């Protein structure tokens, strides 16, 4: 219902705001690799992986038809990390910071799109 360029122009700054977060975004900039990490149970627990680079690609390639699909992918990323990692880990606390940032950025944008 939305043109892919309008979605990208409006939404990409909110993704850029996540990428700008250092150290917090670094573990989220590429898909979780259970082979490199030695965690063969990762895809048992996380059935639908998501990360910043995959969200960026879906914006870049026109895979979102409406902006709540983008918001849902961002929250899928967050919920995957909170689900798999322990609350004392960097990834878990880093994820919480990304959620704080995203909440503030996505707010005016979703209003502007609808
Ligand atoms: C810049 O490419 C690298 C980024 C980080 C690396 N990676 C590591 C490493 C494994 C070595 C031992 C260590 O200590 N790692 C580490 C952990 C956190 C870091 C960090 C390094 O450096 C950047 C800031 O935070 N574990 C990770 C866990 C996840 C993850 C998420 C999200 N959901 O579920 C899981 C499980 C994702 C990436 C991970 C992988 C390539």
Residue numbers in the entry: 1084 to 1197
List sentences from the manuscript.
Many proteins, including the EP300/CBP histone acetyltransferases (HATs), contain several targetable domains. EP300 and CBP broadly regulate the activity of other proteins through their protein acetyltransferase catalytic activity. These proteins contain several highly homologous domains, including KIX, bromodomains (BRDs) and HAT domains, through which they interact with, dock to, and acetylate target proteins, respectively. EP300/CBP are critical gene-regulatory targets in cancer, with existing high potency inhibitors of either the catalytic HAT domain or protein-binding bromodomain (BRD).
Since recombinant CBP BRD was more robust in biochemical assays and crystallization studies, Kd values were determined for all compound-CBP interactions by MST, and co-crystal structures of the CBP BRD with five of the seven analogues were determined.
